[PDB]
C-alpha cells in the first residue's frame, strides 16, 4: 500500500475547482501503483484551506469544489481500485453565530435540523473567551485560533460519529487522517475509530524532536518515537490506526546532508518509528505544512529523491506528496521507485537490513530482494552481492533488484 497526498497549500486557489482538476490526474495516479489518496478537508471553513471547519455537513461551500464533484472524484478513484481518505478536522471548530456575550460560540452543522447545532457548553472548559466554563477540560492540546471541542460530551461523540458514518456511506470515503491528533486523547480517537470502522486511519501527532547544543537533532530519538507508539497501542494495535512517522522525517532532513550515519541506530535498526513498529508508521518526505508554501520543516530541495529512494524501498507505509510527483518533474523517477517496491512485494513490515551507514553512504537491503544506496559515494559495486541488477539511479541514489 502506498499513500498519495492529493493537494498542497495552494490547491484551494485552483481555477475551476480542485476536485475537477484532480479528475484529470486519476489515470496517472492509479497507474503509478497508488492505493490511497488523501483528500483535503471537505467542509465549509473560515480559512480557505479547510482547517477551520464550521458547518461540517456543508460540502458545497468548500473552495475545493462541491459535493457532486467530490462524489464523482471518489467514484472515479473507487472504479480504478483506489481508496479515498478524508482529512478529519475535529479538535476545533468555528462557530456560525454570536451568543449573548457577543462571542462566536453558536455552532451550525449545515443541515436544517439540530445535527451538530452545539453551543458554548460543547467547548472545552478553559478555552477562553469562547467557553462558558461549563464543559469538560480539554483532553489534549489547545488549538489557539479556534474553539476546542469537548470530546467527553456524549452528544458531541454521538453526532460526530454520525457525521463520520455519513462521510463514509453517502460520500464514499474509506478512511481518515486525523488532523492535530495531539489535541485530544487517544481514548477519544479510539471511540471515533471503533465506531466509524474505517479501513485505514492515520493520525497527525507532531511534537518536537530532542535537540543538542549544536542546534541539530540528537542521534537517539527514542522519546519521540515512543510517543507515537504509545498512542497506537492505546487506540488499538490490532486495528486500522497508524501515525505519521515524524521521527524519520526529522532525521532524514539532516542525515541527507553528509551525515548518513544518523540512519543507523545503536541496535542496527532504523532510528525512526519504522525501526520499532513499521506496520504502524506512514513515512513521508514533506506535506502541505512542512513543505509546499508554508515551509515549516522542508526537506532539502536538491535531495528530495534521496528521501523518496529511502521511504519507497523501506518498511512502513510511504506517502507521496502531490508537488513532488507532478510539479517538480520527478514523476518518472518516483514512478520507477514505486514499481520496484510493487513488483517485489515490499510492504509495511518488510525486513530492513542496514549494511553500511557512513557519512557519505547508506546501504541497506530489504527482504533480500532490493538493495538501496543513498549518498555521493561513487563506486560501491564491491558491496553489492551477485544476482543484483541496477533498477533505478539518480542524484545520489541507486537501487538494485535481485534476479
Amino acid at each position: 500500500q502506498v499513500l498519495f497526498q492529493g493537494f498542497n497549500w495552494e490547491s484551494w486557489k485552483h481555477n475551476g475547482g480542485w476536485y475537477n482538476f484532480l479528475m484529470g490526474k486519476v489515470d496517472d495516479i492509479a497507474a503509478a501503483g497508488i492505493t490511497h489518496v488523501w483528500l483535503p478537508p471537505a467542509s465549509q471553513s473560515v480559512a480557505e484551506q479547510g482547517y477551520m471547519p464550521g458547518r461540517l455537513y456543508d460540502l458545497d461551500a468548500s473552495k475545493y469544489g462541491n459535493k457532486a464533484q467530490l462524489k464523482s472524484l471518489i467514484g472515479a478513484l473507487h472504479g480504478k481500485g483506489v481508496k479515498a481518505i478524508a482529512d478529519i478536522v475535529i479538535n476545533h471548530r468555528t462557530a456560525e453565530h454570536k451568543d449573548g456575550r457577543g462571542i462566536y460560540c453558536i455552532f451550525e452543522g449545515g443541515t436544517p435540523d439540530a445535527r451538530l447545532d452545539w453551543g458554548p457548553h460543547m467547548i472545552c472548559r478553559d478555552d477562553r473567551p469562547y467557553a462558558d466554563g461549563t464543559g469538560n477540560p480539554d483532553t489534549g492540546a489547545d488549538f489557539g485560533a479556534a474553539p476546542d471541542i469537548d470530546h467527553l460530551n456524549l452528544r458531541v461523540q454521538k453526532e460526530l460519529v454520525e457525521w463520520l458514518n455519513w462521510l463514509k456511506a453517502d460520500i464514499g470515503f474509506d478512511g481518515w487522517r486525523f488532523d492535530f491528533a495531539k489535541g485530544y486523547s487517544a481514548d477519544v480517537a479510539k471511540i471515533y475509530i471503533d465506531r466509524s470502522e474505517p479501513s485505514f486511519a492515520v493520525a497527525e501527532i507532531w511534537t518536537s524532536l530532542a535537540y543538542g547544543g549544536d542546534g541539530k537533532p540528537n542521534l537517539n530519538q527514542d522519546q519521540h518515537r515512543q510517543e507515537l507508539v504509545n498512542w497506537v497501542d492505546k487506540v488499538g494495535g490490532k486495528g486500522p490506526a497508524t501515525t505519521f512517522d515524524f521521527t524519520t522525517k526529522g532525521i532524514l532532513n539532516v542525515a541527507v546532508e553528509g551525515e548518513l550515519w544518523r540512519l543507523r541506530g545503536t541496535d542496527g535498526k532504523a532510528p525512526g518509528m519504522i525501526g520499532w513498529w513499521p506496520a504502524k508508521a506512514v513515512t513521508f518526505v514533506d506535506n502541505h505544512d512542512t513543505g509546499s508554501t508554508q515551509h515549516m520543516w522542508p526537506f532539502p530541495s536538491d535531495r528530495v529523491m534521496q528521501g523518496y529512494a529511502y521511504i519507497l524501498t523501506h518498511p512502513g507505509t510511504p506517502c507521496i506528496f502531490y508537488d513532488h510527483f507532478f510539479d517538480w518533474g520527478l514523476k518518472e523517477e518516483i514512478d520507477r521507485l514505486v514499481s520496484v517496491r510493487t513488483r517485489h512485494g515490499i510492504h509495511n513490515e518488510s525486513k530492513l537490513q542496514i549494511i553500511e551507514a557512513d557519512a557519505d553512504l547508506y546501504l541497506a537491503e530489504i527482504d533480500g530482494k532490493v538493495i538501496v544506496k543513498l549518498g555521493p559515494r561513487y563506486d560501491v559495486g564491491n558491496l553489492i552481492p551477485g544476482g543484483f541488477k541496477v533498477a533505478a539511479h539518480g542524484n545520489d541514489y541507486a537501487v538494485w533488484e535481485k534476479i
Partner: protein, 181 residues
C-alpha cells in the same frame, strides 16, 4: 479578575514588575529565549531560542497590554506586551511584535520598530495560555493581532539560528524567576 494567574516554576504568580526566563517545559527542546540576527538582516534582531538546554537566555518583562495595570499579576488569556530586558547592538526597541513580512516564506516575531503598522497596531499583542486541559503549569504563547496564532520555533537552522514564529510544533514553555535588571 477572572482568568487564572500564570505561575512561575516556584508556583508563584507572574508579576508585571519582575523578570522571567522563558524556558522549554522539556529541556530536550532547548534553552531559553534570546535575540539573534539572521536571514540576511543585521537589524532588527529576531526572537531566537538558545539550542543549549543549560542556557536560560535573556530575561523577559511581561506587561499587561499598555493600559491594563491593576494588581501587577499576569493572568492567562489576556493581552500582554513582551520585552527582552537586555542591551543590543541594534540599539532599537527590544519589544516583540509579529513581522509583517516573510523571511524564507515564514512569519517570525521580531524586535525593533514596527515597519508597516496595521490600523489596529496590535502587532505587539501576545497572550499566554495553558498548552492543554491538564492541571500542569505548562504554557504556550500566541500572537494576537487580528486573530490569535500559536507560536513555535523553527529549529532547522534556516537563516542561521532557531527563530520564534508562526509554525508547528507549538513551543510549550515554563517561566523561571530571573534576577532584577
Amino acid at each position: 479578575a477572572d482568568p487564572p494567574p500564570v505561575h512561575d516554576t516556584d508556583g508563584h504568580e507572574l508579576r508585571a514588575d519582575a523578570n522571567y526566563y522563558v524556558l522549554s517545559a522539556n529541556r530536550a527542546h532547548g534553552g531559553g529565549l534570546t535575540m539573534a540576527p539572521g536571514h540576511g538582516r543585521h537589524c532588527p534582531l529576531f526572537v531566537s531560542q538558545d539550542p543549549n538546554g543549560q542556557h536560560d537566555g535573556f530575561p523577559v518583562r511581561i506587561t499587561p497590554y499598555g493600559v491594563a495595570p491593576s494588581d501587577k499579576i499576569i493572568r492567562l488569556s489576556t493581552d500582554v506586551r513582551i520585552s527582552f530586558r537586555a542591551y543590543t547592538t541594534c540599539l532599537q526597541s527590544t519589544e516583540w511584535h509579529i513581522d509583517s513580512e516573510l523571511a524564507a516564506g515564514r512569519r517570525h516575531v521580531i524586535t525593533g520598530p514596527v515597519k508597516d503598522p496595521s490600523p489596529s497596531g496590535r502587532e505587539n499583542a501576545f497572550r499566554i495560555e495553558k498548552y492543554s486541559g491538564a492541571e500542569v503549569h505548562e504554557y504556550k504563547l500566541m500572537s494576537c493581532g487580528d486573530w490569535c496564532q500559536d507560536l513555535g520555533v523553527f529549529r532547522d537552522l534556516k537563516g542561521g539560528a532557531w527563530f520564534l514564529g508562526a509554525t508547528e510544533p507549538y513551543h510549550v514553555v515554563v517561566f523561571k524567576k530571573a534576577p532584577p535588571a
